[PDB]
Amino acid sequence: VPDRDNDGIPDSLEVEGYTVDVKNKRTFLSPWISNIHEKKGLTKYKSSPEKWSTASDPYSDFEKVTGRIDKNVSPEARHPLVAAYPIVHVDMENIILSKNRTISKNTSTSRTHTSGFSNSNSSTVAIDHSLSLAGERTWAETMGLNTADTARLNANIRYVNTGTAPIYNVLPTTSLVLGKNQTLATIKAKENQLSQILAPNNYYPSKNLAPIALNAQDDFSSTPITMNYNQFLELEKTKQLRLDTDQVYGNIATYNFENGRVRVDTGSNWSEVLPQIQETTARIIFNGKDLNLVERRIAAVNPSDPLETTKPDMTLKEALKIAFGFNEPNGNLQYQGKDITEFDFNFDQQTSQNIKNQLAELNATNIYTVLDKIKLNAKMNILIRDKRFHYDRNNIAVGADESVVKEAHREVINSSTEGLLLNIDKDIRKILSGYIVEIEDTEGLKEVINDRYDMLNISSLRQDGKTFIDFKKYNDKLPLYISNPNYKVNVYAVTKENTIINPSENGDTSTNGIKKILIFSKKGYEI
Amino acid sequence: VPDRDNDGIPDSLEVEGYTVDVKNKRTFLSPWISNIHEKKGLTKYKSSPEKWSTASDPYSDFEKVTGRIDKNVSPEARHPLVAAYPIVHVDMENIILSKNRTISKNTSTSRTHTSGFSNSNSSTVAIDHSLSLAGERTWAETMGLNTADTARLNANIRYVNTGTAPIYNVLPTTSLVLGKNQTLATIKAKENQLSQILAPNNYYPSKNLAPIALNAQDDFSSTPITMNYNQFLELEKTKQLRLDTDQVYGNIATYNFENGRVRVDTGSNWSEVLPQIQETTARIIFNGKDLNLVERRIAAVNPSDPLETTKPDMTLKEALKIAFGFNEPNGNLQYQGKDITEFDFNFDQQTSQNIKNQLAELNATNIYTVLDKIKLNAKMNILIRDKRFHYDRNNIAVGADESVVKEAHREVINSSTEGLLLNIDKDIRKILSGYIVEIEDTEGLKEVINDRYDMLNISSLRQDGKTFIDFKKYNDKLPLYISNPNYKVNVYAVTKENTIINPSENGDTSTNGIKKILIFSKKGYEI
Amino acid sequence: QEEHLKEIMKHIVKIEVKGEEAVKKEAAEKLLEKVPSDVLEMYKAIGGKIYIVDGDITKHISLEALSEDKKKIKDIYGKDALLHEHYVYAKEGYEPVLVIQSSEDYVENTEKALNVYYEIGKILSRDILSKINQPYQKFLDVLNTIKNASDSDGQDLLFTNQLKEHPTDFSVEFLEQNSNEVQEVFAKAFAYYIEPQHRDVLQLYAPEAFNYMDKFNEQEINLSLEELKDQRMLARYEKWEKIKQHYQ
Amino acid sequence: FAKAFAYYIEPQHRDVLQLYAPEAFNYMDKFNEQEINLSLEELKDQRMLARYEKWEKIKQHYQHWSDSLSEEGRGLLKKLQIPIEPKKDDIIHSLSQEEKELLKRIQIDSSDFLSTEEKEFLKKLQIDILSEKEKEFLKKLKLDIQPYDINQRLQDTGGLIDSPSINLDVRKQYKRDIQNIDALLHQSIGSTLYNKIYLYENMNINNLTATLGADLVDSTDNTKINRGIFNEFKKNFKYSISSNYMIVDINERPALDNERLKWRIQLSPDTRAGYLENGKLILQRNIGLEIKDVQIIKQSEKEYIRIDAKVVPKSKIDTKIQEAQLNINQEWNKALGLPKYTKLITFNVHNRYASNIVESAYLILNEWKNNIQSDLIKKVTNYLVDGNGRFVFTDITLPNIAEQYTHQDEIYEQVHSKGLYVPESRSILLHGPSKGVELRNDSEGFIHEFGHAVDDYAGYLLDKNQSDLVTNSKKFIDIFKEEGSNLTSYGRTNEAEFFAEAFRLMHSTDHAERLKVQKNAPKTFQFINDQIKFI
């Protein structure tokens, strides 16, 4: 039996379909039989008879499907047509400031993607704006910063691997940037210190250990991160930073046939492979799971190249099926309940043109029908986002239609004079910055309790996942008073897009010019 | 005879069952015969026909069972289905403090485990609170500490290997942490100095030598462990320190067939193997032996992976049988007398769900019955702790039900006016902080001799394991007086959980608000 | 590295289990195999045959009722031993009989095979050849060459104490007057010669004895059978039958 | 069928077949590479013209041989196909004395030794003219009324043509005719004109084993075969040897009612053979055949047994018999306690059902030991070895082996039956092929013969000088006069058979039979328990 690619599997099997199936204790490779394998829940593999690794990453077609492989490659990447490679970005948990009266705020970071969008990781941190201290109005004064002073920046970060394969020795160099181009610092690539592993969906260091301190705390530079006044001003007006990271990972862990040992070979290095993967696969970005950008690459054919025409034709439907988890309970593509029709398709200009052609030779207008007839070619970039939410320039979930917001609140488990304990779907509370509470006199007056832009963070989360809104937090540590059991109690929610991050022109602090959505309205009797 | 895994043993033998048995002076491998091998007390081995090492650690199926292996690997790990790997944690024996009149106290450490528990070793020290010196009330003053001063910390530590395999060159880096995230110091990884061996259940340096001084005593840093005042305050209120250690061990010792030489190969390093083990085995934690957390890993099947379905099915009962020493005198699982029913089973949320399923397809509710019908899958975490003791958040033994405490004392070997000489079960005296002695007037009065919160450590241990309570220790070096041969002498015991570690609000030192259990009450003439 | 695994792997992995009792039969048959067949035919021709018992050799019908007195036996090395413990005894009489206790360790070890071969050599010298007085001058000549030779420990290896004290060279009369001692020396040499691992020792310390036995087992044993047969009337008569029939 | 065939032929799927359908793979594996070349011929075997073309092709090659045939050769070949029945006038003219008048008034129909055809023969013989001296003259007469049948002599003697079992003149005649026939078959089949040639022969099951032949055919519907007995027949049928002259056909022809075996025999170019003008071939004697397969087939609504076979040198099969001889002797010498090298279970077989005889030894003895008291077996075996006796399993008639003829010495003293015990030689003979007119199986035949031997040793222990049985002692003859007729009619014949019959029954495998003998002959039961005590 011929086998040109020298990858264990014979040619015909690779072209037509095969599957590995365990017979009591021995595993053997078999040609796909329609009737005996389908009942057993086995996947029909296909691959290239002329490629030692159809995806082009460092694991052979045979190794992947057979399980002889670094046991850390994520499961969904075991299928021969899904490239397995790392994607490391940096997540900053909190910062602190002073001058070479310590501004200590918690931060939230999200992996970003913007638009002709290219293969380079960047993240984006947002510093909390809410006033942890009552008296700390205006940062410029809480820290004695003068026109001729300089502030020091000291943050905590952890690395997150959201890819599909482990990195071993190296940790990426990564540069912090404020504004458009003001590079404050480049985080050194520590040497011979990352002897641990970053498996997919893991943190370094783990959630159980102190996070890696950004400032060295040693003698390398007394304050490496100096920062002039004007810069500090820029930061105060924008409250946003960027973290750009490159692709310099370590070596690769390979499987040895003589004894099954996985040793990090010093010859193979990810910086030689990534270009290959990136130039021969179609890339699909999905924010379905938890509104975070998950990126996968599928091996598609490229007409111009002989060796490349060898790869099995890949239709979009299958791509979604094998890369993310879509299935067919009733033949309708859906991801854990949500039908495929609730998602957007966005394409780069190239891919757009190509798909318009494909839709023309078939005489169809709605791609959601002819979904299983769209051929993927190499280098297409596709963005599938939930259709219900509003988005900003960096494709981060930022808001939503008010009506959806209301349905998300229609389940009042209990109500009293001390607050609400709701049970809301975990995804909505990442596009709500806070709530405005107000009381209405029986004759139409309006009293807003937390009537300051930076006093909205009143919604905490209990250990049983029930959100609890506390009135006494930014009140006077006093219960909630009502001048009339007929006075209505109104609760409003403020979406991210409509929030204010700095005092206005004339330093207005009132919540007047804020687009507010009605979220609750029960009279005194109900409470 | 075919043999794909290339591990010496043929396929059929590995799948069906075999055993090694010494025939007068020559050792040979045989297929298991039910009737002629059982009377000889030989174990029935099974393994994977497609894995050079079923556990996935660096010793072949053949080497383990035949004995050709580093003679240091612990006995229980010789069986092919039990992973052999190291588990190193740091034990701190005593500390001393001063200012850049030195408080030198002995400490006790316990390897910890807390809850969603992850694969990283950490320990926890507790500093003795009892007053060694009468006049040393309030640490803040025994050391001339000022608001703008700094104290120096100098402790002694030893490394403990509680795993099942030896480490050779390296010794792990480990960082001390007070409170939640305040890292006081990271203990350097001394270079080319741990040329000795840490066999399982051993100390480095051995119990017969001075422990490794933490402070260098050289010129590297005058006081590497600086510590601001506020830090010192937290420490004074809590008396707890955490020791987090990572997994960077050395190389691996391999067996050479040509001459039987065990050489440390510089290519293979435990930091490449542990991930494999950690992702393909079920982990069982047991505190049965001496109330210390012993962790073992057993090779279990993982449905999703072809190569992995090859491993022998593992039932919970057999796992306990081969990993820890449980046996069946009368067909009832037991560990040295204690029936299996005296232990709790706690499971991580995943494993919990999985086992609930397993209990559903069998229609049973008490797992203690259906024990031999529970299949283990990869990645389960199971925690088996003694049902009789109360436990704290870090699963350390901390207290117990009063009835057990009283029953543990019903054997009065001797009683006089100078103290008791008991013989108690070695495990109980690890949850008792001390005793309150009092004398009772014939009309109900109450005189507590050692009436101070920090004066409880009055129970020593004689060289024959007989506990001796000394009254003259925290007395006035005088014997015990009794105002009436009819007056009862009452003794109470205070368990750790119910102890106080700092003076109260108004600095009360009296044992009033301490939950005390009566342990003894004999009249004046019954002594 | 992969090469070595194969030999150790083969030595240790018994593919199938022969059985509990088969091994015994296979062991004994292999042992008796190494002795030249012609000896077995001579033994059968003179009567009694070897039977392998399984239990305590001390208690068997054939031997319990005869030779009770000879409970003291001396192994090949000259150390005493009691018959019950010993694993092989033989008896010379009207019914020459040889009894061997079955065991599974005759291929694996060698010290037990040496005692068995020693007994076969004793049967050969005392019961077969003695009917023809085959040990004679050639044997006496080698024997005599062993006693007088440069510090040859060979004597220690083959002679008992009685021999080391005959001052002069060996004489043809002595063998006649004393014939148990010489037959013993013959038996020992025979035993050491058959067993592969001891063959070298023999040729090393008693060269002439090795040469003698080599030519004896090589081409001087068929003559023993033919000459023995020349005593049997029926052998002569069958011979006449065959010769007259064919050329008739 | 088609599906399996497809998966097996396609290289890549063959392994899948073997993994999920092991049995199917084995069947197809054996099917497509030897039997397949077979079934083609049978298709051609249906077309008349193919039959006639191959027959004619076979003719010319033997044309030269046929053209050179003399008169003596053809006359001999004539005699071989049709036996010559004996002519009455010759025998009548051969007696002429007082014995014939004496014979005149004899109770003819009272001799068990005679068979039906011989009774008929004598009854019509009496057109030319009891417990005494007349059945011995009838015993002699039996050795003179047998038909002159060369082929019968050849299986009865197993190729040992010098057997003194018949009159000398007849013996010379037979030797001469057979040697002449041996010279006639000088032409080998070997040619460059043809490859594998298959020939056919229809055979009656009763010729090989009358024990199986009685229940082979389904009791209700004669067109079906009982699968249970078939499996037994097939179990150990692995090789066979033909010592006599095979009369084979060329084209399959319909068989008679009693022929249920349809043989397909392949030949070798070296096999010597003769051609017959009537579409038959005469094969040389002493041919060895290995059986490759045994199956049930259907034809014209009736079931049959298809048996193939391949000709090979007889020596190759003979080696199997000697190696079997050594295996059984080594195993039982250890199991009994006999000297390592004894020749005890020697069996010599030269017939069509050989392999079953050998394998059946490993069963008759297993049933023999587990059913008899260990000490009796050991003691009697010891007695037997003390002499030159050996057990003898054969497939030729008993009168021709060796031991039986010599000691009796009279020509007329010949006896043939299912089993026999010779005191002079102390040997037990078990003829497998025949079926006991009484016994249910072969094991019982053995135990019966064993009884005669035990009776001899038991009688031997009482006194060494005198040769006598336990019977003939006045303390048993009387016992035979009272209870002798309370069991089967066969044992009523005389004391020796009675003892043997009682012995099997007292040791039968069916406890019920034992109870029967308990409640029907209470005296004998304590007597038997008293002779066996001597141990």
User: According to the 3-state scheme, what is the secondary structure of B320-353?
Assistant: HHHHCCCECCCCCCEECCEEHHHEEEEECHHHHH
Selecting from B53, B56, B309 the residue whose C-beta is nearest the C-beta of A22 gives B309
Verify whether the Cβ–Cβ distance A25 to B246 is below 8 Å. no
Is the Cβ–Cβ distance between C227 and C38 less than 8 Å? no
Question: How far apart are alpha carbons D91 and D379 in whole angstroms?
Answer: 51
Half-sphere exposure in the Cβ direction for A222 (13 Å, CA): 3
Coil, helix or strand at residue D41: helix
Token pair listed for D269: 């170019």
Amino acid identity for residue A441 in this structure: D
Virtual torsion, Cα A116, A118, A121, A127, nearest 10 deg: -10
Residues 6 or more apart whose Cβ sits within 8 Å of residue C240: none
Instruction: Exactly one of D201, D252, D449, D495 is catalytic; name it.
Output: D449
Q: Is D425 helix (H, G, I), strand (E, B) or coil?
A: coil
Report yes or no: B55 and B81 within 8 Å, Cβ to Cβ.
Answer: yes
Interface contact C30, partner D, CB < 8 A: no
List CB contacts of A64: < 8 A, sequence separation 6 or more: A73, A77, A78, A79, A80, A84
The alpha-helical segments, DSSP class H, found in B188-297 are 229-238, 270-279
Q: B52 vs chain A: nearest CA distance in angstroms?
A: 6
Say yes or no: D6 contacts chain A, CB-CB below 8 A.
Answer: no
Strand duo B156-161 + B151-153: pairing: unpaired
CA A474/CA A471 separation, integer angstroms:
7
Please return the burial class of D75, using the count of CB atoms within 10 Å of its CB with bins 0-12, 13-18 and 19+.
exposed
Give dist(CA A8, CA A27) in Å, integer.
14
Measured in whole angstroms, how far is the alpha carbon of residue A480 from the centre of its chain?
39
Distance between D338 CA and the closest CA of chain C, angstroms: 7
- A435: closest CA among C21, A445, A424? A424
3-state secondary structure of B272: helix
8 Å CB contact between A270 and A249: yes
- Indicate which technique resolved this structure: cryo-EM
Question: Quick one: tokens of D307?
Answer: 């048996």
Q: How far is CA A47 from CA A20, A66, A76, B242, B493, in A?
A: 14, 14, 16, 52, 72
Q: What is the C-alpha separation between C87 and C91, in angstroms, rounded?
A: 14
Short-list B123, B73, B117, B162, CA closest to B278: B117
Non-local (6+) Cβ contacts of C170 within 8 A are C140, C143, C144, C147
Any idea what the Cα angle at residue A435 is, between residues A434 and A436, rounded to 5°? Answer: 135
- Verify whether the Cβ–Cβ distance C1 to B257 is below 8 Å: yes
User: Taking Cα atoms as reference points, which of B158, B107, B100, B98 lies closest to residue B132?
Assistant: B107
CA–CA min distance B460, chain A (Å):
38
Question: Taking chain B, what is the end-to-end CA distance rounded to the nearest angstrom?
Answer: 79
**C9: three-class secondary structure by DSSP:** helix
Nearest CA in chain A to B2: A26
How far apart CA D424 and CA D446 sit, in angstroms, is 19
The DSSP-derived string for B401-457 is -HHHHHHTT-----B-SS-BEE---TTGGGSEEEEEEEEE-TTS--EESS-STT---
Classify B520 as helix, strand or coil. Answer: strand
Q: How many helices (H) and strands (E) does chain C have?
A: 13, 5
D449 annotated active-site: yes
Q: Compute how many other C-beta atoms are within 10 angstroms of the C-beta atom of residue A332.
A: 10
Task: Round to whole Å and give the CA distance between A47 and A50.
Answer: 9
Of residues D302, D283, D307, the one with CA closest to residue D202: D307
CB contact under 8 A, C4 and B258: yes
Is D448 annotated as ligand-binding? Answer: yes
Task: Assign 3-state DSSP to chain A and report helix, strand, coil percentages, each to 5.
Answer: 15, 30, 50
Q: How many CA atoms lie within 13 A of B352 on its CB side?
A: 7
CA distance D108 to D115: 11
Helix and strand numbers, DSSP H then E, in chain B: 10, 29
Report helix, strand or coil for A371.
Answer: helix
State the Cα–Cα distance between residues B476 and A320, nearest whole angstrom.
Answer: 82
Query: For chain D, which chains pass the contact test of at least 3 CB pairs under 8 Å?
Result: A, C
Neighboring chain A residues of B275 at a CB cutoff of 8 Å:
71-72, 166, 197, 199
C72 interfaces chain B, CB cutoff of 8 Å = no
The residue of chain A nearest to residue D15, with distances taken between CA atoms, is: A30
Mutate to test the interface with B, among C13, C16, C17, C107 (most CBs of B within 10 A): C13
Q: Give the span between the Cα atoms of B157 and A78, in whole angstroms.
A: 45
Nearest to B262 by CA among B73, B128, B390, B418: B73
D10 near A CB under 8 A: no
Residue in chain A nearest B57 by alpha carbon = A261
* Residues in chain A preceding a C-to-N separation beyond 2.5 angstroms (breaks): 100, 115
Q: Is D452 flagged in the annotation as binding?
A: yes
Using CA atoms, how far apart are residues A289 and A383, in angstroms rounded to an integer?
A: 14
CB nearest A22 (choices: B52, B248, B310):
B310
Taking the CA of residue D497 and the nearest CA in chain C, the distance in Å comes to: 34
Q: For residue B42, give the 3-state DSSP assignment.
A: coil
Residues whose CB is less than 8 angstroms from the CB of residue B464 and which lie 6 or more positions away in sequence, other chains included: none
Which conformational region is residue B283 in: left (phi greater than 0), alpha (psi within -120 to 50 degrees), or beta? beta
Query: Is B in contact with D (3 or more beta carbon pairs below 8 Å)?
Result: no
Q: With an 8 Å Cβ cutoff, is D104 touching chain A?
A: no
- CB count within 10 Å of CB B355 equals 20
* Closest-CA residue of chain C to B11: C15
Which ranges constitute the DSSP H helices of A243-327?
Answer: 270-279, 306-309, 316-323
Contact in structure between D520 and D487 (CB atoms under 8 Å): yes
What tokens does D78 get?
Answer: 């004539």
CA B429 vs CA A261, B290, B399, D260: distances in Å: 47, 11, 11, 92
